[model samples]
Target: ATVFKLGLFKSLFLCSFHDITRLFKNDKTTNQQWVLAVFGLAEVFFEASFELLKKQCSFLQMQKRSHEGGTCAVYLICFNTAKSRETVRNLMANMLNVREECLMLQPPKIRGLSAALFWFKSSLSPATLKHGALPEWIRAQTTLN
Candidate 1:
């Protein structure tokens, strides 16, 4: 088994420096594509789970169930570089919406979920994400906290 600090991901996902540094190239937005990603994300948000087979570039396939962790021993998060465990810790706690005090985790795995130039990654379910505020939904799932 391989172990990775949360900082790697904080630097990985949230940091968009490369995109910024690029001298050219940026998406102009496709309305049709967004509805597709949004629809799938909506389902995952509400169910917190899904089984999608035989679909290419499927957003549901590119996800992790961090919302499903608790005192159970699925995993643990450790501190890291001067970036401070505190900096990255708060990010995961907010992103996965886990309790900061007892941040047991079932980390996200996406190495095998390659492809889909126009794709997304997340694992929370809501019937509709249009105008949906993450704070409320994130609050709704902390019943375990």
Candidate 2:
């Protein structure tokens, strides 16, 4: 009877272990979740930064400077914001696929492009424009071209 009880206990222990594993069968890895979380934070950072810049320069100013020619149109604020977002996205994407998953965790030292175009497009608001206040360039360019 003692030997029989021991065998039953071992079976029950194994069954419980199996159930615990099954409970978490669909759970993602820490790295995967971490990457996703970073993406969310980065998005917020970009969005908030843009809002502040828009307040400082006004959407009209941003639009005018971005196309003013000879300079990095899009303005430093928009360019930097978009570039940072893209860099983070690229680094995270590479980390997720690479064997050295933690390799690109740090932001790169070099300057690059980000969602600047997306933000620029969003800044353009014809609906909010005052009557006869529309800029010729803005009115002429209907698309994101």
Candidate 3:
């Protein structure tokens, strides 16, 4: 009886893995879908983390600076919003898992290359040509390149 059980369990495990591989390789969706799916999952996790954290720690809206030196909206609202240890702990748990799962997806490697190339191509193309119209001074500037 034990010998038969071992083979049955192995067969079931192999079948489960095969189904998963089929899902990843399926053509029902495009590469875009895979990329989108990764982001969608990350969004859910990020938002859920924020909500969970907000319950434990108050959140507020404020302005932050961009890398280019402009201001942007930011949420830096509060600390210790949770009334108790239990709530804060729960929030922290959700946030931790979200962070872990996000890192596991290796999103930066996939998304970063596309962004880098986009900017590179954009820089090579004349800006005057892209915007439908360019001021005389700006058009003159493009000649330098």
Candidate 4:
């Protein structure tokens, strides 16, 4: 079995500069298409995670107001803020390479949210991507920190 590792600090999607060129040239080999597809999914994942974090930040602000007298509120706010910042930073950096590669190519005419869902279902579903670290990280973002 071949191993596809998702490096913590970098994408393992398209490992070489030539992969990017082949992708832009409309290569449809299994691996090239897989790389492009994963790039699309990463953009969707990071964008969704960013929105989720923003919503959490809003909810935390509301809690801070309601729990004005509690020191625990202060701790919760600080902890949440710190973790949110770290996650956002990590996601953006992880997303950068894929995003740059994707930007140069014209994607199919799929609806934004629909495409994300389809990609999740088609590519990341089954036993295929579950063995990779990326899937776990994406799942973690949607859960409580």
TM-score leader? 3
TM-score of 3: 0.21
Give the whole-model CA lDDT for all candidates, comma-separated: 0.25, 0.26, 0.27, 0.26
Q: Which residue pairs clash in candidate 3? A: 56-82, 57-81, 60-77
lDDT of 2 by residue, 69-138 (tens): 1111112221222233334345434433322221112211111122222223535554221222333334
Would you list the clashing residue pairs of candidate 2?
A: 66-74, 82-114, 83-113, 83-114
Name the lDDT value of residue 53 in candidate 2: 41
How well is each residue in 1-145 modelled by candidate 3, as lDDT tens digits? 3333223322322222111111332222222111111111233454444455444332222111122322111122234422222332333335544322121110112223333232233345442112112223223434455
Error of 1 at 6 (Å): 18
- Scanning candidate 3 in windows of ten residues, the lowest lDDT window is 31-40
Tens digits of lDDT, candidate 1, 1-145: 1113232232333422122121212232111111110111232333332221112112222322222221111111111222233443454344434455433222222122221111222323342222212222223443355
Candidate 2 deviant stretches above 4 angstroms: 1-41, 59-145
When 3 and 4 are scored with TM-score, the better candidate is 3
In order, how many clashes per candidate?
A: 7, 4, 3, 0
